[PDB]
Design a binder for these strands. Structure first.
Ligand SMILES: Nc1ncnc2c1ncn2[C@@H]1O[C@H](COP(=O)(O)OP(=O)(O)NP(=O)(O)O)[C@@H](O)[C@H]1O
Ligand code: SF4
Lengths: 760, 834
DNA sequence: TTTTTCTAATGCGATCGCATTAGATTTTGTTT
């Protein structure tokens, strides 16, 4: 009745009877086309209304694209014979805590703390802890262990008292045992485990201040929502009386707090008349460090039973639509030994990083200019591989608000006003495109600033009232006009009279000052003149959304705040807002490409110790904030037994072999990043890997991957003292300004804007 | 008798005044009755009526909270009782039964064990009035033979929204016009003449119903979808700006009707003041900065003397206002008179200038101390006899009254000053000195406040699917909404009908595409394209940006340059090419020196820096550096203690513990772990010096170096840490460092600091190259990196490195290399290499 | 004028402790 015929493999997911059901949706098989064709079949054949439907996803982008295929296929269901509710996982628990929030007594007025303002609140419970921490580290380095245990105790539901007795029955197996041959390194293992129990009373003063202020986290939401469903069995009773068909998408990324919340509510053996469908594959489970549950695909079927002991059914649904063959024979051999999907390459190895980027800038510029996306694991790595492809002539879209050169000239110049001791935001102003100072006039302000300026006296400086000979009081008192040039004295006086006016608007309300500095600067007119004509009128998207964050914050001191808040956002958040474009070659990373497709895909740097990222990897016995697997949930993550050791040659052999199982398991999370990169292709595929790196004295070869893919493609282009190149830059408009100077439906606007300007 | 006259605008409250004159009143709002007599005294409520019949909120809120703390609840709610979010769900259960007249016993008949406990709590609250049970008590009090005979005409005028307990205070007095309007929640009179709606607008409303229009109106209905939340907020500020300026309907004839003003209407009024369109417009009184300027003078007077931290807040406030760069001119000119060599604080010096008279040096900074003396003499020589006396003795308030006249920045700033200053005077008279301090345009609005407006032009913003039909459920613990109906999409559709009824000229319905609701598509069939991603504006800082975008590009150029010519002739900052940013010139482009007998002065700690990046040298020196960096001034306190020649091991440790308290650490658990880390960094020195006293011999400690290494001829200036003397007559060089991480041995002999000290030992200021050590206090013993004695060949290989680099500081256009130190540099954001 | 990271390896030598240091210092969403 208006669509395509469904596949014979899709005619079992669509016509499956009500009851719990699993769909192992493979790579590129389109689990959204074959999901809106079950909401329709569970409406047109009875069994529901279109208001008893619930759809849950992780991201909000994959939620808005599920309304647009439920609502479409239901308007064409009403053409031949109430709207469905789709929402994310973390917004389904904010709903569940505004209704039933007072049973387990959490307030309904509870604000949600931001990543930046959460760091602001735990830094002050570490800097105000009366005690003796005795930790080699610093504040602002032990408050990033508080925020990583308390974000991992409220994710496995541990309740902070099981963690106090873990260091025992391992600190006695080192001392009370005898040798068979304390070893000075196994004590260093034991040093980190007596460090958690020294910062347990730190993270418990964090929870007692997040309840005297009634604020929560995003991981604190699913902690309270998980407990409420299990404790009170009346919450799930009034939700199976409202929603009678529930959808769960990308369920392989579901953590452990989102698992016993959705299994007590929706059918842990509750009501067999409910049609419940959870999808996702076990083989694109690429996160593992963020939601981290290695379960939920094996432990679903015994978890959502038929309420009479019989476990659920499981459906294959494996087909590839946006994928050609000869790129499946690789991806079936990558994921071999870890039902293979069936359908409906140019390997290389250079010996220079800077020259292997020329090899991928050949194919990405020869097939473009003859008539695509580059998947790089590290974002920092992505930036260099955009100049080697700009010179070839291909347009580039590589995908920080506080680093945008119109916002960053408004963060500074708001900092010269407040404190005239930040000198690094005076050289941003004096050397910028407005008032270009030369080298001889910068070095003559500093001579003015000095002429204006024992153990008991060295500590007298570095006081909060110390006089330090800053530059910015040689602007407001430049002296005698014979040290500067006649062109450079006329700008210091002008700069001085601009800051004397803007410093009187300083006790004024705070979003009325960020919109006042921005008018005195040339912003919002120089931000649009640097935009091409093909864009339209759009020039000030990411400068307006700065000021929709100053006024949200100030609901403000402008010196104590917004300078502590913006600078804590640079490190902790690395930019408050990215700012979207109108929306070329996309040089996005490998995690941002989950769910997309292109034509030519280049995976450039498959060297050793780069793609696998073996380096900078730590486990629970070499750092504090890493939650040992005795009490970790879903304990995959094999735990050492500790009970079969009576000799020191046994103990340090258990530890040195359990430290390999917890790192073999992180090489297995890499092969799932090949598979979520290889299958994003739809056409030819570009695999490569350099040999000489960039900053070594000894080369790193190919990884275990590129040495395997040469054996896959053969069972294939034969492309099989580093450098001292040092980049350095010395420190139209002239065509256009001829026309405006020589001159002296746009014309009706100018005649309208002058009707207000020439009329008091 | 009793008559009734049951559409929008059709002449109902106008007809009720004609009956109220031709024979010679009840409105329901304290604002609606203001204009209701404006039509009666030009021709010639309920909750204020039942008060006089019963004569002839936070105080209420605390009473439920106290009795919940002391207290037949079903024992599942026992954790929730001590909260303050249970005293609002319980407060609104007793309010939705008072509007419907339910006894506390009458709720106990409804039981469901949860309602029985509220049925017992309610009759316990009677035994211990309000503005809700005022009508419900006058009905229970009811004199009616004297009351009903006193009235000749009854005019209720508004019965579409009127509670049933208020429906029987009128029907008890049931002359008696019962006007109403039965849609937008006895002989009958209907009306059809709209009288306040175009026939294009009236057909849009009654199309949604599945009354005619004014034929003299000219109307249009349109629906415009945007593509982003930013573009949706700009085409509204476009449309309110096209209409006033091109067409010409004035302000206070336009309104932006939103469903709920926190979710949309607060973020939209910010994106609409920026485009020049006025908004008619909350905050506490204690947080008002101009109010607490003079309340501090009360706070000081009630304690007899002014503190340190409470006296700087007067200089940073509106009484005597200093910018942040004249504190730094006061503080240098107050430490020059009281010139102790360890100088005082700034709080302790500020009191000694207000109290007495500083007469060492004062020219313009004495005037800013008189206006703090004269206020703090009027605070010494009813409290409001001194409030105005302190107000008037200052030079304050004669400023803004000569400044609220002009000014667009200070003009609204001066008006919010006195409107917050006067609102603190009236809080003082309502108290009747220690107790007064201890106790202290376009109308954007919601649909329920948009029922008393004329409003030619109407914009209904935010008609999207998330919030105009509220699927936001309202279940709860007590179950109020299940009780309110036993005792919705079609309901919210009336609000979109009752919003478009207020528009006579035009209607604009705006959404985004974040989806369109299923109401906007139901407007399209009665109304008169892709979504917009880049919208046109009419701001004068918006044309001048687009015209400059086409005139500097890879026909229209001749059109645009004529328009920029007439913009620049009258004003419009940004149109003249003397004001562009890419058309400015450098000031000098002249070198730092000339006259080739000039001799530069290096320094051995900034000589590796100057061979590493020369732009880094020019902007760390010559200003530009983040600040104090306390890890420096602890690592220089150690160089002072070690440098003394006559102290033992216990002599040094006691002189560090006495001075350590004046070091600005937060986290006082870290100020103790950094002292014990720096006690052991003095043990590690004397453990090392006595271990190598047999090998070396001290000559002098902390020697100034100043000579001529080469003769442009360079000049070497520095302070050698500790110079030694080897057993073969040589002279090794020790540079004591206090870091943790030592430099590698491959980099320990190319070290540009030690290779200038021993180059300064040769050729005067001895005369043997000697050697070089690098002692790392911190991390057997303290690790040391060594450098060889110099050759007559490696000297010339190093003497050409000093002389070639020292000429790179002369000329303009410095190099900017990308080094290993880019991650730790202050000057990074102005780097051309980044 | 002179100053300021830390881990986990990778080699040493009298297994394992002491030492140097050469490679880096990842990826990143989730309410109103
Ligand atoms: N014959 C008339 N002469 C003058 N004005 C008229 C006439 N008929 C209607 N109007 C206008 O129509 C409006 C009457 O408003 P009214 O009927 O009181 O509003 P409503 O929509 O019924 N709401 P409410 O007043 O609260 O009951 C006024 O603006 C009148 O000026
Ligand atoms: S970023 Fe590079 S060029 Fe800029 S100051 Fe630092 S080292 Fe010099």
């Amino acid at each position: 009745l208006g669509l395509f015929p469904p596949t014979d493999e899709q005619a079992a997911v669509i016509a499956a009877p009500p009851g719990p059901l699993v769909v192992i949706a493979g790579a590129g098989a389109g689990k959204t086309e074959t999901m809106a064709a079950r909401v329709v079949w569970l409406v047109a054949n009875g069994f529901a209304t279109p208001s008893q439907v619930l759809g849950l996803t992780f991201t909000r982008k994959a939620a808005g694209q599920l309304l647009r295929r439920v609502r479409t296929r239901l308007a064409r269901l009403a053409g031949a014979g109430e709207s469905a509710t789709v929402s994310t996982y973390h917004a389904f628990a904010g709903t569940l805590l505004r209704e039933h929030g007072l049973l387990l007594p959490v307030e309904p007025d509870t604000r949600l703390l931001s990543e930046t303002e959460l760091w602001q609140l735990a830094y002050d419970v570490v800097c105000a802890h009366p005690g003796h921490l005795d930790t080699e580290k610093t504040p602002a380095a032990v408050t990033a262990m508080v925020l990583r245990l308390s974000g991992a105790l409220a994710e496995h539901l541990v309740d902070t008292d099981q963690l106090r007795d873990t260091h025992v029955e391992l600190e006695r197996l080192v001392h009370t045992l005898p040798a068979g041959p304390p070893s000075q390194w196994l004590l260093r293992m034991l040093a980190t485990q007596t460090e958690r129990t020294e910062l347990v009373p730190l993270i418990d003063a964090l929870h007692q201040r997040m309840r005297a202020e009634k604020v929560m986290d995003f991981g604190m939401q699913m902690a309270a929502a998980a407990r409420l469903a299990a404790r009170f069995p009346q919450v799930g009773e009034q939700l199976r009386q409202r929603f009678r068909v529930v959808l769960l998408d990308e369920y392989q990324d579901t953590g452990h707090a989102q698992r016993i919340a959705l299994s007590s509510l929706f059918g842990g053996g509750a009501d067999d008349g409910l049609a419940l469908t959870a999808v996702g594959d076990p083989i694109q489970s690429i996160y593992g460090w963020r939601g981290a549950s290695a379960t939920n695909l094996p432990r679903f079927t015994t978890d959502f039973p038929y309420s009479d002991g019989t476990p659920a059914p499981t459906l294959e649904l494996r087909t590839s639509w946006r994928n050609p063959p000869s790129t499946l024979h690789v991806a079936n051999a990558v994921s071999e030994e870890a039902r293979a999907l069936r359908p409906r390459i140019r390997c290389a190895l250079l010996n220079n990083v800077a020259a292997e980027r020329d090899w991928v800038a050949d194919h990405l510029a020869r097939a473009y200019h003859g008539a695509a996306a580059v998947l790089v694991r590290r974002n920092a790595d992505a930036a260099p591989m955009a100049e080697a492809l700009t010179a070839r002539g291909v347009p580039v879209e590589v995908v920080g608000l506080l680093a945008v050169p119109e916002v960053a000239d408004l963060v500074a110049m708001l900092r010269l006003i407040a404190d005239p001791t930040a000198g690094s935001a005076v050289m941003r102003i004096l050397t910028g495109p407005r008032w270009r100072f030369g080298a001889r006039d910068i070095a003559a302000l500093w001579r003015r600033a000095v002429e204006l300026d024992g153990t008991a006296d060295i500590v007298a400086q570095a006081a909060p009232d110390a006089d330090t000979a800053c530059v910015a009081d040689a602007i407001c008192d430049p002296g005698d006009a014979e040290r500067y040039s006649p062109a450079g004295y006329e700008r210091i006086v002008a700069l001085g009279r601009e800051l004397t006016m803007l410093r009187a608007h300083l006790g004024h309300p705070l979003p009325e000052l960020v919109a006042e500095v921005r008018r005195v600067l040339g912003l919002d007119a120089e931000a649009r003149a640097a935009r091409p004509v093909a864009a339209g009128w759009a020039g000030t998207e990411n400068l307006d959304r700065f000021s929709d964050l100053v006024s949200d914050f100030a609901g403000g001191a402008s010196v104590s705040a917004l300078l502590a808040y913006l600078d804590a956002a640079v490190e902790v958040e690395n930019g408050l807002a990215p700012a979207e474009l109108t929306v070329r070659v996309q040089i996005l990373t490998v995690h941002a490409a989950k769910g997309l497709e292109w034509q030519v895909v280049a995976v450039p740097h498959l060297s050793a110790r780069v793609f696998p990222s073996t380096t900078q990897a730590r486990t629970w016995l070499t750092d504090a904030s890493d939650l040992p697997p005795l009490l970790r949930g879903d304990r995959g993550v094999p735990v050492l037994d500790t009970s079969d050791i009576y000799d020191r040659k046994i103990l340090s052999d258990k530890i040195s072999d359990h430290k390999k199982s917890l790192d073999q398991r992180r090489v297995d999370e890499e092969r799932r990043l090949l598979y979520v990169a290889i299958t994003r292709a739809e056409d030819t595929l570009l695999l490569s890997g350099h040999h000489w790196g960039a900053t070594e004295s000894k080369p790193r070869g190919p990884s275990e991957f590129l040495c395997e893919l040469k054996t896959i493609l053969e069972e294939e282009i034969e492309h099989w003292p580093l450098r001292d190149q040092v980049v350095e830059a010395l420190w139209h408009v002239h065509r256009g300004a001829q026309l405006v100077a020589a001159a002296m439906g746009w014309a009706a606007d100018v005649d309208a804007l002058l009707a207000e300007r020439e009329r008091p | 008798g009793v008559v009734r006259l049951l559409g929008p605008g059709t002449g109902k409250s106008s007809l009720l005044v004609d009956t109220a004159v031709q024979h010679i009143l009840l409105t329901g709002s304290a604002r609606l009755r203001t204009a209701a007599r404006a039509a009666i005294t030009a021709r010639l409520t309920v909750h204020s009526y039942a008060f006089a019949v019963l004569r002839l909120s936070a105080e209420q809120d605390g009473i439920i909270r106290e009795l919940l703390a002391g207290d037949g609840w079903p024992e599942q709610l026992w954790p929730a009782l001590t909260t303050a979010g249970f005293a609002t769900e319980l407060r609104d259960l007793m309010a939705r039964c008072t509007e419907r007249g339910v006894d506390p016993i009458a709720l106990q008949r409804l039981g469901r064990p949860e309602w029985l406990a509220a049925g017992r709590f309610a009759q316990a609250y009677e035994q211990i009035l309000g503005a809700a049970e005022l009508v419900g008590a006058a009905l229970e009090a009811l004199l009616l033979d004297t009351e009903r005979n006193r009235i000749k005409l009854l005019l209720v005028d508004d019965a579409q929204h009127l509670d049933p307990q208020a429906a029987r205070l009128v029907r008890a007095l049931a002359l008696t016009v019962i006007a109403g309007d039965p849609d937008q929640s006895h002989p009958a009179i209907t009306l059809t003449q709209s009288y306040r709606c175009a026939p294009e607008i009236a057909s849009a409303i009654t199309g949604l119903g599945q009354w005619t229009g004014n034929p003299q109106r000219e109307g249009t209905v349109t629906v415009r979808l945007a593509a982003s939340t930013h573009a949706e907020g700009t085409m509204i500020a476009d449309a309110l700006r096209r209409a006033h300026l091109v067409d010409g309907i004035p302000w206070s004839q336009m309104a932006v009707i939103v469903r709920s003003v926190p979710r949309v209407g607060t973020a939209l009024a910010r994106a609409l003041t920026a485009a020049g369109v006025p908004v008619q417009d909350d905050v506490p009184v204690g947080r008002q900065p101009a109010a607490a300027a003079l309340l501090t003078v009360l706070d000081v007077t009630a304690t007899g003397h002014l503190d340190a931290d409470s006296a700087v807040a007067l200089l940073t406030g509106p009484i005597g206002r200093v910018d942040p760069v004249t504190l730094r001119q006061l503080r240098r000119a107050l430490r020059r008179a009281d010139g102790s060599q360890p100088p005082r604080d700034f709080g302790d010096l500020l009191v000694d200038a207000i109290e007495r008279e500083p007469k060492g040096l004062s020219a313009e900074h004495a005037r800013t101390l008189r206006r703090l003396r004269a206020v703090l003499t009027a605070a010494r020589r009813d409290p409001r006899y001194t409030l105005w006396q302190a107000w008037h003795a200052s030079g304050l308030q004669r400023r803004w009254l000569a400044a609220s006249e002009r000014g667009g920045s200070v003009g609204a700033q001066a008006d919010r000053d006195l409107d917050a200053v006067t609102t603190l005077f009236d809080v003082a008279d309502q108290y009747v000195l220690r107790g007064l301090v201890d106790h202290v345009a376009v109308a954007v609005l919601s649909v329920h406040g948009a029922l008393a407006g004329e409003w030619d032009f109407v914009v209904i913003a935010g008609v999207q699917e998330g919030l105009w039909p509220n699927m936001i459920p309202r279940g709860g613990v007590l179950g109020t909404q299940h009780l309110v109906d036993v005792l919705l999409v079609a309901e919210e559709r009336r609000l979109l009908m009752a919003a478009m009824g207020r528009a006579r000229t035009r209607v604009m319905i705006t959404a985004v595409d974040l989806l369109p609701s299923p109401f906007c598509a139901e407007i399209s069939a009665w109304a008169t394209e892709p979504p917009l991603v880049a919208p046109r504006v009419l701001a004068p800082s918006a044309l001048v940006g687009r015209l400059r975008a086409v005139v500097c590009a890879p026909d229209a150029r001749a059109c645009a340059a004529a328009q920029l010519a007439r913009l620049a002739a009258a004003g419009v900052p940004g149109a003249d090419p003397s004001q562009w940013h890419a058309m400015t010139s450098l000031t000098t482009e002249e070198p730092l020196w000339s006259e080739p007998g000039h001799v530069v002065t290096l320094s051995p700690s900034t000589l590796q820096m100057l061979t590493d990046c020369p732009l880094r040298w020019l902007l760390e020196r010559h200003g530009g550096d983040d600040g104090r960096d306390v890890r420096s001034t602890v690592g220089s306190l150690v160089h002072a203690l070690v440098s003394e020649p006559g102290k033992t091991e216990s002599q040094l440790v006691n002189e560090l513990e006495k001075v350590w308290d004046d070091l600005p650490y937060d986290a006082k658990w870290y100020s103790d772990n950094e002292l014990a880390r720096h006690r052991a960094m003095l043990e590690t020195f004397t453990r090392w010096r006595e271990d190598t006293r047999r090998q070396l011999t001290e000559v002098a400690t902390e020697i100034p170096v100043e000579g001529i290494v080469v003769e442009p001829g360079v000049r070497v200036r520095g302070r050698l840490d500790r110079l030694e003397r080897d057993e073969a007559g040589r002279l090794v060089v020790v540079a004591l460092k206090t870091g943790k991480s030592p430099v590698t041995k491959d980099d320990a002999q190319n070290h540009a600091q030690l290779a200038m000290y021993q180059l300064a030992v040769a050729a005067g200021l001895g005369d043997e190259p000697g050697g070089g050590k690098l002692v790392y206090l911190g991390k057997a013993g303290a690790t040391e990196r060594e450098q060889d004695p110099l050759t007559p060949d490696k000297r010339a290989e190093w003497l050409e490195t000093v002389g070639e680099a020292a000429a790179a500081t002369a000329g303009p256009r410095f190099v900017a290399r990308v080094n290993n130190g880019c991650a730790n540099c202050p000057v990074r954001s102005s780097c051309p290499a980044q």
